[PDB]
Enzyme design. Structure first.
Site, PDB file in Angstrom:
ATOM      1  N   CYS D  76       1.463  -1.072   0.031  1.00 14.70           N
ATOM      2  CA  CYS D  76      -0.077  -0.181  -0.022  1.00 14.70           C
ATOM      3  C   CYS D  76       0.484   1.411   0.002  1.00 14.70           C
ATOM      4  O   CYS D  76       2.008   1.435   0.406  1.00 14.70           O
ATOM      5  CB  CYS D  76      -0.971   0.173   0.850  1.00 14.70           C
ATOM      6  N   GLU D  77       0.511   2.236  -1.019  1.00  9.21           N
ATOM      7  CA  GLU D  77       1.226   3.004  -1.195  1.00  9.21           C
ATOM      8  C   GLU D  77       0.818   4.306   0.792  1.00  9.21           C
ATOM      9  O   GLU D  77       2.237   5.303   0.796  1.00  9.21           O
ATOM     10  CB  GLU D  77       0.941   4.525  -1.979  1.00  9.21           C
ATOM     11  N   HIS D  78      -0.149   3.954   1.395  1.00 12.12           N
ATOM     12  CA  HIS D  78      -0.518   4.819   2.446  1.00 12.12           C
ATOM     13  C   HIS D  78       0.649   4.507   3.181  1.00 12.12           C
ATOM     14  O   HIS D  78       0.889   5.021   4.228  1.00 12.12           O
ATOM     15  CB  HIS D  78      -1.728   4.645   2.838  1.00 12.12           C
ATOM     16  N   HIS D  79       0.949   3.166   3.844  1.00  9.21           N
ATOM     17  CA  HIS D  79       1.700   2.563   4.834  1.00  9.21           C
ATOM     18  C   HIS D  79       2.721   1.529   5.082  1.00  9.21           C
ATOM     19  O   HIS D  79       3.772   1.367   5.178  1.00  9.21           O
ATOM     20  CB  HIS D  79       0.526   1.693   5.519  1.00  9.21           C
ATOM     21  N   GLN D 118      -4.930  -0.245  -4.709  1.00  7.64           N
ATOM     22  CA  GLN D 118      -5.397  -1.618  -5.769  1.00  7.64           C
ATOM     23  C   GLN D 118      -6.020  -1.743  -6.277  1.00  7.64           C
ATOM     24  O   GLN D 118      -6.134  -1.498  -7.878  1.00  7.64           O
ATOM     25  CB  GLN D 118      -6.271  -2.292  -4.265  1.00  7.64           C
ATOM     26  N   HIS D 146      -5.549  -6.776   2.874  1.00 10.43           N
ATOM     27  CA  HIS D 146      -4.214  -5.154   3.122  1.00 10.43           C
ATOM     28  C   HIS D 146      -4.163  -5.043   4.349  1.00 10.43           C
ATOM     29  O   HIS D 146      -5.272  -5.956   5.168  1.00 10.43           O
ATOM     30  CB  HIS D 146      -5.435  -4.348   3.299  1.00 10.43           C
ATOM     31  N   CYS D 148      -2.571  -3.464   5.883  1.00 11.50           N
ATOM     32  CA  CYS D 148      -2.318  -1.824   6.035  1.00 11.50           C
ATOM     33  C   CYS D 148      -3.650  -2.508   6.841  1.00 11.50           C
ATOM     34  O   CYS D 148      -3.630  -1.129   8.381  1.00 11.50           O
ATOM     35  CB  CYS D 148      -3.611  -0.936   4.479  1.00 11.50           C
TER      36      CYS D 148
END
Lengths: 186, 186, 186, 186, 186, 186, 186, 186, 186, 186
Positions: D76-79, D118, D146, D148
């Site tokens: 994930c690009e967020h975490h 995704q 995820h 995440c």
């Protein structure tokens, strides 16, 4: 802030009333344990569950999104006993407004963490999404087992209750509902 | 006869204390519903569970009997929340003293219908069988999921607790225990 | 009190170094998110996991207790990527000292919330139990999938690693170990 | 060429900052291991994923091809934590232009080997196919879990996210979409 | 470096000899594709598989470690057609020497990447582990389906071949072997 | 008659070229074994697969016939490695021209016994059936795993490719296609 | 060579005798079809099944080999109706004498292609292996369903018959037998 | 010959006595239907269950034969309501005496076709086999669900009762019992 | 009355013709056993399958009834070898005419107990139901495995043939057909 | 209050008539046990099952509610033998009138506690729900196994009967029926 000591006193009264010995080793701490548990499982009474969608949304995207098998639990308002299972949330974003997944899950949790009917959780989650996300449509399905029913005189273990709420495009487009249901099976 | 009104009053206090509106349509009868529920699920506090074996059948058979996947539920004494699953009961009759299947189930239910530990249900059922059936041995296994665990902060759905009690021949014959375990797998 | 800002700065360096644009919209909050995540998943570095057993129940119970399929997750210390699966914990109480189920789960979580080896989590859980419960014996089994291995060079999805630790009576009694293993299969 | 040393220094800072001992045996090589891992899992930042379709086979076949249960993983690009699951890719060849199966898989892998959403993997795969294969239509479905979400505070293991992208004939032919979904269930 | 052109010439001869048209569109590149494939699947002929161990950390850990369901594939040396399935590797560490999990998998791969007998892969993996890890014992089990059998005149799809190798303590301790087998079932 | 010697020579060359010892005991007979295998698996190059339907049985039955889970295997023409799985064949007979079940299977086998694309096998079977049976329609579905993909660099075991061909009534009647698909799930 | 015409005449007599019309379209060719079928399924009457082991592979391997789920079919000698299922063959090679997998399967087939008892197939396969492979031991297990029982007389569909034969080391080593049985159960 | 008319008269009395209208359409034929049913399900009262055990000699048929999943049903003698499930019968032939497989099944049926206890069916089947086959040993296991328990007040659907009887060698050889149990699991 | 002796003589001729020894112990009684078997499995040649079909009357009942997984077996008329599986029968009663379950099953059995095609069984059962029940419609589906195909040269075990017949409302209402199919899956 | 003595006398007559010894130990109390059982399982003859419908009012809730896998049992009126399985009940509330889940289950039980046809239980439950809930529509599906069929001459274990009743919107909306069926499979 919940008054745990008041709840504990009530629990102790209940234990005496059912013919138990509240001073026996296994029950001494039960009143407070029950209080702490209620604090946790009813925490949603103190929270607006819509606030989780007051947040920056995800990168624009225009197609069906489905999040399935989101575990939840709650307490039947009739009996104050747990029911639990999964929620499935699908929707059609509008103008790229997409919900963070963890935010979705927090809504479900927050709506859940109070005395409930499964039906009301289902529609509330659907309404919050229509309000906050303003999508072309939403479909929410919940599947759960109720202890209200497994432990009591009726005694029907294995019974699942399934609720659904459709708004917007899902209300009129059966092909879309149908695709969601196929994706949920797997 | 338990004092339902007293319990209902305590439940109402609990509902106020958690921040709920006890007069709203969905909760108005909840205090009394909870009282009636407790009367049912804690009925075992008023019963001797061993009375169900006051009738035993005399036909002459000495070999293993296993009754498996007997559904049960109970309430953890620590949190007064349901736990539920299956019991398996195996014994070696002697002098053809055999337990009626429904009597077995009634014993499990009666022992269960009070605030419990799974461990104590397991051993109690085993002890009652040794006392009343006087078999060569008994083996009791219980498998359950605790909501104590699924709905609370710890949040571990799918966790199963397994308890066992062996008496008589099962205590000293590992081959026999082993055969029971194979037959329970399925 | 973790220095989140420091971590965030390091994450930003990492993102530049791998050839990303750290100023693009999808990454701007990533450094702080990662910091907050690390604060959560490594919280165990600041906790003594043994404190959860500072409260234990005294019953008259001496037979096997098995808690199986306790979900856990952790981060490999080699690559700082998650591994996850289940833990199974079995013990033989001594002098009726029984562990609260949720306390057990907390120990698993706390030991897990730091960079780990599966092997070390397994033995540490076992050691903590021997020390704090003083049971006749303990057996801990963990089963997990490592992303260290699914996403990375070896690329072997579906591989499960299984670790075990036996202490006390489980170390010398193969029948007992064998029974635990049968009960864990189901 | 990634600057691994720079990444390793940043990882060391992170380990100190979270309260770990970077000099302990299990962590000494971790900074470089994390660097090498990032070099591998983010390799896609340096590749055009569309090159794998620079070789296409021309045989006059005009009917549905579906490749299902293609394992993939990404971060994930967020975490910067893995998510993983399966991709299903269906298309209607045009003028007998058929994709090598392994080329399909490579496209999924290459698009995946970078920090992602995704949703973006799903649509990018679909777009690359439309562009390089020029089929009558494409349908891409991805299903993933995820971390995440599984390892963090939200703690919802089992939650699956399902994304889809339809182009060309799949956009307008609901029967066709429906047949793909049936063939994916099995 | 292998001589791909040579292999490609031989493949072309094979295609003419079986009555195929090597110039048709679907086969033009097949000779070189087969050459590149052989280069990849027989790469192990050029490598020492033992070099991957020991990524050995010191733990003070003496209990069983099992890595199961490691996917592998190889080519039967009798027919040069694939066989594939899983390997399971168990060992008893000595003096706290633990193997990196990915190093284990690499050994299986490397031993596999050459024309093989399943039996030889099994023993070779076991030997390499005794040599390089110096554990108290190792047990290796492999389970595979052979196309040697599924596609040929004999035509027995679903046939699984299972091989095993035990060394050290696993050779003499049947209880230990037995526990490994139980853990591999599931 | 295939020139087996010529194929054997080419296989020997391939073994030397990959760095193997062609005279080691496990490979001495491999060249001829591979030649005999190719003779068998590519026998279809010498056969008209349509001849099996030069035989039909006049019953006057007009309703759907589905033969499902017909095992097949073939060799990808791109890499000459096996792919295998099942075929499902459905048709709507016309004038007692029902196909013998074994004749169907023989067609599948014969079409399969040559270097192939799964797509081409699927359409060819469907075309042969339309030509020889003259039914109201035919639907052919094939599901297979490709080693082209499981053993090579791409490394995606568990990927299934699904192809279909519809002719006649199945081309225009989506309800019919749908019913076939339901009947194939079970 | 068998006398098909003679068989066909006998089949025609049977059809008349049961009250069928042997001249109706569906039966005209049935006599010769049944003759050809018998020629095929009873071909083993004319073959020595031991010849398939006249070629053995030499490599110094001494550990357990198990080939499981080998499909077979045969005809009960009591009723001349098929029975079918799987054979599992395990052996301990001696002096590296290992059986080709396809040779094993051929032995099972050849022994099977005659009117049989399952028990005799089982022991014959075991005997042939001891004679031709001279292993330390063999274990053969067969599992089958008998139409003798599903269509006619008992009318017990789903009944499985399981036969076994142990020779050599398997006769005396219960641990070994046990391990085989565990490996067969997956 | 049973007096069906007498039974029908008694059934009619029962229907009146429970408050039903015996003349309503759905009950008119019930008395005779119940009579005809009793004639069929209690037919065993008029037969010697065996009474019919002819063997054939096979050579080195000294090894275990197991017939598993033999469907059976019977009527509890306590309530005259069905119980049903499977029987498994294993024996060690002596001097090559093999039972016809269908004869076994018939013995189970015949012993079953009368008011029973599961325990008695189990031992009777075992005794008949010892008497008529004179094997080295026999093991009989039965697994069943009792409606005595599913439909009544006790209300425990899913409960299985398992009985066993061992004679001869199975009584003293635990390894043998164990092998039977493993083979029954599958 | 069938002439069993005539059949037995023909079977003996067959056994000699295939190269068997008809005087060996296992075959001595086979001729008569085969005769008795044919008498049983072809008994339907002497019976009208419609004649025992009685209906039950429930006033006004007009909704879908489905009886699924009705086991059947028959003998292919082409090879006289069994095929077996399940029949599913669905109908829309008219004016409350409903079929007794056991009557339905008997029709299936009686139609089956003669040399057959699966297709003809399917339509015949459908016709008989239109005739004898006069419902709004009927749908019959049969699923079977043919030994015609598992034991012979073609050798395709696991192949299922599926036939269907629709009459009345099921012929023109695809939604209804679809609902039946969904209910049959489970 | 039913006349148990009268029933007991009739049961004794039945036991004599079938050729049993009513004075033997296992049958002495059977007559009275059967009487008490009939009193319980036919208690619904004395109750109005519609009285349980205490609906609940939730707001304006108008979306689908499905309660699935409700266990039930009854006695066929034709043979007075149990049939059992599950009921699924779906409805579209109108004006927020929702049914308590336990109330629904009670209706099913009460309707069931009398001699029945599955078809009549199905419609009666549907009617009661239309009458008492006044929903937009109801759909009831029941799935059961009949001992009428498993224990008798017909002998078809595993046969399931499926009945349905649709009212209101479910009668006209096939998409809705279809969605219910999908959710029941799941």
């Amino acid at each position: 802030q919940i008054d745990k000591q008041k709840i504990a006193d009530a629990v102790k009264v209940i234990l005496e009333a059912v013919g138990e010995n509240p001073d026996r080793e296994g029950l001494i701490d039960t009143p407070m344990r029950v209080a702490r548990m209620y604090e946790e499982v009813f925490a949603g009474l103190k929270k607006d569950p819509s606030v989780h969608f007051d947040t920056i949304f995800e990168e624009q995207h225009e197609e069906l999104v489905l999040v399935k098998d989101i575990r939840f639990s709650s307490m039947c308002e009739h009996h104050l006993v747990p029911f639990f299972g999964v929620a499935h949330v699908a929707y059609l974003p509008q103008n790229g407004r997409v919900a963070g997944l963890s935010k979705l899950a927090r809504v479900v949790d927050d709506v859940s963490r109070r005395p409930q009917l499964q039906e009301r959780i289902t529609t509330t989650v659907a309404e919050i999404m229509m309000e906050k996300l303003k999508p072309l449509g939403v479909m929410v399905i919940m599947e759960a087992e109720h202890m209200c029913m497994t432990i009591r005189g009726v005694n029907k273990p294995g019974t699942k209750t399934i609720t659904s709420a459709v708004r917007g495009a899902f209300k009129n487009d059966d092909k879309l509902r149908s695709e969601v249901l196929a994706l949920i099976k797997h």
